[PDB]
Structure formats: C-alpha cells, structure tokens
Design a protein around this ligand. Structure first.
Ligand SMILES: [Cl-]
Length: 225
C-alpha cells in the first residue's frame, strides 16, 4: 500500500501540508517520525530525500552515483539491488561490483556502500537533483557548461566539483525523491517555516526554470524499515 495515491490523469502535481505528509509517511513506514527526522524534513526539498534514505550517517544525500538519465539510474539501481540481495560483506560487495557488466565501469560504487549497515538492510533508491552548473564564479562559461556532462559511455556525471552554489538570485537546488510505487517525484518549496511538500510528475519536477541548468538522477543506498 503506497504512501500516497497516484496523481489524477490531468494533474502535474499534488501539494501536501507537511503535517499531512508526515502522517502519510508514518502510515507507510509503520512508525513515528523521530525528532531528528522532523528536523531534517524541515530543511525542505533536501530533507524529503534525506529522511527517505533513513540513514543517520548522512546529512546530505550522497552524489557519488549520479547520471544524466533516469534510465541509467534505474539500471544501476537494479544492478546494486541484485548484489545486496545476496547479503554481501563489504569485501564481497567490492568483488561483486568488479564483476558486474554495468557497475565495473563506474566511479564511486565501492564508496557508495555504507559499511556499518548490514547489506541485508539496504536498498538502492533514486532521487533527482537539479542544480546550477556554474559552481565556481571563476570558471569560464565553457568550463561551467561541460563540467557536468554525462560520460558518453556510462552516462555518469562527475559531481566532485559540486559546491552547492546557487545561480545568484535563485535557489541552490531541488531534490526529488523517486516514489516508484506511483511513479511520482517528491520535493518541496523550501525549508521551514511555510514549507510545502510536492508530489509531481517527472515532467513537472523537471520543467524549465531560471534557477537550474543541470539535472542528474542519483542512486544511493537507503536503509529499509
Ligand atoms: Cl506533467
């Protein structure tokens, strides 16, 4: 039973009072949201994703495994879920990753595993991040506009230069949590107060905006309930 129903056929998004989202969240995860979790949620869009990763070792969603297209992220998700479904130790995970036709060509796959969480408690999850390319005002325009181009072979986007810099006069980022039960994207407007949670179609979440000129689809390990 999904956290929320799907969107109507003629709807691009549904808006949620934070209080109503939390109740739906608590029904779905079958437990009360903690104070640390509520505090993370109050950070806005980034909080929706941090709370859903369910990982106390994270304050920000990890960008290690970021890709130019949703389909690549979905393939990487399936590959990773297949490996952690065998309950590997960290060393067994590294070996498995090395043999996997998709994962072995990627950067940061080994780093993506949280060693202190047993692999039987993990699942690969997806979120989409929108951001501004000009992360250093000193960069030339050519550098800004090529730094986050996806690898022509693996579709992987190098995020190591990313500094959470906003386009001057705009919001720094958006994060959208991929709800694969209903095929919607969960985000928010900004941090508390007056935070509103959004449940959007991918097209609406991805729509042209002055704030952002880059979008990636990112795979990260979440901790199961
Ligand atoms: Cl739409």
């Amino acid at each position: 039973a999904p956290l929320a129903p799907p969107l109507a056929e003629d709807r691009s998004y549904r808006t949620w009072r934070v209080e109503d989202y939390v109740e739906a969240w608590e029904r779905y995860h079958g437990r009360e949201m903690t104070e640390d979790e509520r505090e993370n949620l109050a950070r806005g869009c980034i909080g929706v994703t941090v709370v859903n990763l369910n990982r106390e070792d994270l304050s920000n969603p990890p960008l290690n495994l970021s890709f130019g297209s949703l389909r690549t992220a979905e393939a990487v998700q399936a590959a990773l879920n297949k490996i952690v479904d065998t309950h590997p130790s960290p060393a067994q995970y590294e070996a498995a990753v090395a043999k996997d036709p998709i994962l072995k060509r990627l950067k940061n796959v080994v780093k993506a595993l949280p060693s202190w969480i047993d692999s039987a408690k993990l699942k690969a999850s997806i979120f989409s991040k929108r951001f501004y390319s000009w992360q250093n005002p000193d960069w030339s325009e050519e550098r800004a506009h090529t730094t986050y181009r996806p690898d022509r072979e693996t579709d992987q986007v190098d995020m190591s230069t990313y500094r959470y810099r906003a386009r001057p006069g705009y919001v720094n980022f958006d994060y959208g949590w991929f709800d694969q039960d209903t095929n919607t994207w969960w985000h928010a407007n900004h941090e508390e107060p007056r935070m509103v949670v959004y449940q959007s179609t991918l097209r609406h979440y991805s729509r042209p905006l002055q704030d952002f000129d880059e979008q990636v689809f990112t795979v990260a390990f979440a901790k199961k309930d």
